[PDB]
Structure formats: C-alpha cells, structure tokens
Amino acid sequence: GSHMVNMVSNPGFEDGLDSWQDWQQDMSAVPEAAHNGALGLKIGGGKAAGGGQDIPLKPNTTYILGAWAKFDSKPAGTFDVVVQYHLKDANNTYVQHILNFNETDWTYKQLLFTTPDVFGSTPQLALWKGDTSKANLYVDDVYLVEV
Amino acid sequence: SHMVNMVSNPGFEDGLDSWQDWQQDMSAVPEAAHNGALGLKIGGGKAAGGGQDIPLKPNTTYILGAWAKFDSKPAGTFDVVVQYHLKDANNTYVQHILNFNETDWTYKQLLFTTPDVFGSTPQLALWKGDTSKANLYVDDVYLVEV
Ligand SMILES: [Ca+2]
Ligand SMILES: [Ca+2]
C-alpha cells in the first residue's frame, strides 16, 4: 500500500507522555490503556482533564483526525479528540473539529477537515476528557494524517 | 504510526494505472480532480465502472473513504464498494457500500472489520449505475487500516 503520514508525535504513547502536554496532572501511560503496543494513555476519572500537543499544519489541506478510545465504566459525558485553532479574520473566530466518544468498548472514530488559507494561531490537538464521572478514559493510536 | 492506504493509485495521479476499466468508459482528467492534478471521470450515458483487487488483513478495522460528484443532475447513483466472501461453509458475501448522488464534491466514509478468514480476495468497485448523461468525478479513494 501507500503510506499516509501521521503528524502526531508519540501517537501511540509508546514513549510514555513524551510530546504531550499534561494540563491537569491527570495523565499516565499505562499498559491497561493500550489498544496497540505496550502502552496507552489513561486520563483519570473524577474531574474534567486532558492534554494536547501543538502541531503546525499546512494551509488549504485536508487532514484525517482519528483515535481509538474507551471508558472503563459508563460515562455521563464524553471524551473529545479535537483539533482547534483561531482563524485570521476580524474576530479571530475560534474553530474546533471534534470527535466525541462515550463507549465502554474500544472504539475508533475519525473525521476530516480542511484547513483555512491562513491561521490565526497554531493548531492544537487536544485530548479532552470532559466527563466528570469516576470513569477512567483510555485513548491510544491518535492520528492526524494529511489526505 | 502511519496509515497505509490499500488502494493503488488512489488519487488517479498515475492516470488509470492499477485500475480496471470494465466498460471502456473511464479517463483520468484535470476537471475531475478534487486533489492533485487529476481525478477519475466515468462517462455518462450508460452504467459503467471499474475497480481493483485489494489484499486486506484479517481481523482488522478499516476505513473506506472517497470524494465524488456528478457534473450534472443524475437519475441514479454512484457506489463505492468493498466486497468479499467470508470463509464459512458457504463463502458468505458482504458488500460495504457508500452511495453518492450529489452534484457538489462530497466526502463519505464508513468503517468495517474484516473476518478471521477470507473466502475470496477483496475487491474495491467504483460502480456508476446511473444511466443519465451526467458524468461522474471521483478522487482520493482510500482504504486504511486503523
Ligand atoms: Ca499504544
Ligand atoms: Ca487526484
């Protein structure tokens, strides 16, 4: 086949938390969260928490955003995989391309988006476990792929 | 870390290389491009299509996606299909199908998981069953293991 290149650094958490910002100190790379490889990301339950990474993107370009995720118990809300950035318009409109997960079995989802001609800020890929239940969230194999 | 597209010449950037043209009704042309320099045009006036064999892995999750548009109002549809037999007693047959009838560039996708054993080599079919004068443009057909 033909490779489609993934822009995400340490996308399977195989290098632990390398390259991922940890915003609430609620992240750990652990084998119980692995979908592939030896590790996955666990975001601990009880409060909204997550992390992310800044990823410069090309203008006028289509990307696939995808991930595998599961909660270890039924959540009240969701785990969201997001690409977010400001536009370079009068208001600096903030735009988010969002995948929502609430499943308790490993589930893959993806969306596609096309970037604007100019960016108002550097795109960020955020992994945001907004659910506040005691459910733990596992996520692994994150993709941000051109084409 | 990377996706591998199982579709050969998925953006038609190498013309009709690696694609079968079943009704001699296909061309790779600039007006049919959604991305890059070329896209596939399936000519109107009769049902027609093309495809290729695709060597999928068993017990594996795949995403099928494509962009398409008719260049004029169609009567029927354009279908993108992954199809194969299972390896059970009677080689059961499944088709994973995206249907298009839009006149603006439109992206559609689906997810499927492959069986433990295949009864036949999977096929990717691009089938423009529409019989109107409308030409069909398709580009960036991909099939990725995730
Ligand atoms: Ca992993
Ligand atoms: Ca193309």
Kindly provide the residue ranges of all beta strands, DSSP E only, lying in chain B, ordered along the sequence.
Answer: 3-5, 20-21, 26-29, 39-42, 48-53, 61-70, 78-85, 93-100, 106-113, 123-128, 136-145
Nearest CA in chain A to B140: A147
Domain span including residue A88: 1-147
Which CATH number belongs to the domain containing residue A3 in this structure? 2.60.120.260
Place of tokens 């595998």: A68
C-alpha distance from residue A101 to each of A8, A32, A41, A130, B144 (Å): 19, 18, 15, 11, 21
Number of neighbours of residue A18 by Cβ within 10 angstroms: 10
Listed residue (B25, B88, B90, B18) closest to B54, CA to CA: B18
For residue B63, give the 3-state DSSP assignment: strand
Place of tokens 């000519």: B43
Place of tokens 């499927």: B112
Listed residue (A147, A58, A146) closest to B65, CA to CA: A147
Measured between beta carbons, the chain A residues lying within 8 angstroms of B1 are: 6, 8, 11-12
| Residue A25 token pair | 């100190």
Integer Cα distance of B79 and B90 in angstroms: 26
The answer to whether the beta carbons of residues A144 and A87 sit under 8 Å apart is no
The answer to whether the beta carbons of residues B82 and B122 sit under 8 Å apart is yes
DSSP-assigned letters across all residues of A13-48: STTTTTT-EESSS-EEEEGGG-SSSS-EEEE-SSS-
Q: Please, what is the Cα angle at A96 between A90 and A100, to 5 degrees?
A: 165
For residue B2, give the 3-state DSSP assignment: coil
- Quote the DSSP letter at residue B13: T
Place of tokens 């890059």: B36
- How many residues does the structure list for chain B? 146
Query: Which of A1, A6, A108 shows the shortest C-beta gap to B61?
Result: A108
Taking the Cβ of residue B106 and every Cβ of chain A, the question of whether any pair is shorter than 8 Å is answered with: no
Number of neighbours of residue B125 by Cβ within 10 angstroms: 17
Q: Please, what is the Cα angle at B91 between B87 and B96, to 5 degrees?
A: 90
CA atoms within 13 A on the CB side of A19: 15
Cβ contacts below 8 Å, chain A against chain B, sum to 51
CA A106 to mean position of chain CA atoms:
15
Does B13 count as an annotated binding residue?
Answer: yes
How near does any CA of chain B get to the CA of A44, in Å? 25
The answer to whether the beta carbons of residues B34 and B67 sit under 8 Å apart is yes
Among the bound ligands, the one closest to the CA of A67: 1
Interchain pair B2, A2: CB under 8 A: no
Taking the Cβ of residue A105 and every Cβ of chain B, the question of whether any pair is shorter than 8 Å is answered with: no
Q: Please, what is the Cα angle at B53 between B48 and B59, to 5 degrees?
A: 125
Helix then strand then coil, in percent of chain B rounded to 5, is 0, 50, 50
Maximum CA extent, chain A:
46
**Sign of the CA dihedral with B66 first, then A87, A66, and A101 last:** negative
How near does any CA of chain B get to the CA of A110, in Å? 9
CA A17 to mean position of chain CA atoms:
13
CA of B11 to the centre of ligand 2 (A): 4
Q: Give the list of residues 6+ apart from residue A44 with CB closer than 8 angstroms, or none.
A: A26, A27, A28, A136
- H or E element in which residue A94 lies: strand A94-101
* B58-91 residues labelled b (16+ CB within 10 A) or e (exposed): eeebbbbbbbbbbeeebeebbbbbbbbbbeeeee
Q: Phi/psi at A77 (nearest 5 deg)?
A: -115, -140
Does B145 count as an annotated binding residue?
Answer: no
End-to-end CA distance of chain A: 15
Q: Please, what is the Cα angle at A44 between A126 and A52, to 5 degrees?
A: 15
For residue B90, give the 3-state DSSP assignment: coil
Integer Cα distance of B65 and B31 in angstroms: 20
Number of neighbours of residue A16 by Cβ within 10 angstroms: 14
Integer Cα distance of A77 and A100 in angstroms: 9
CA of A130 to the centre of ligand 2 (A): 39
- How many residues does the structure list for chain A? 147
Integer Cα distance of B75 and B139 in angstroms: 21
Listed residue (A50, A56, A60, A2) closest to A25, CA to CA: A50
- Quote the DSSP letter at residue B30: G
Place of tokens 């870390």: B1
Listed residue (A54, A22, A50, A57) closest to A124, CA to CA: A54
Taking the Cβ of residue B75 and every Cβ of chain A, the question of whether any pair is shorter than 8 Å is answered with: no
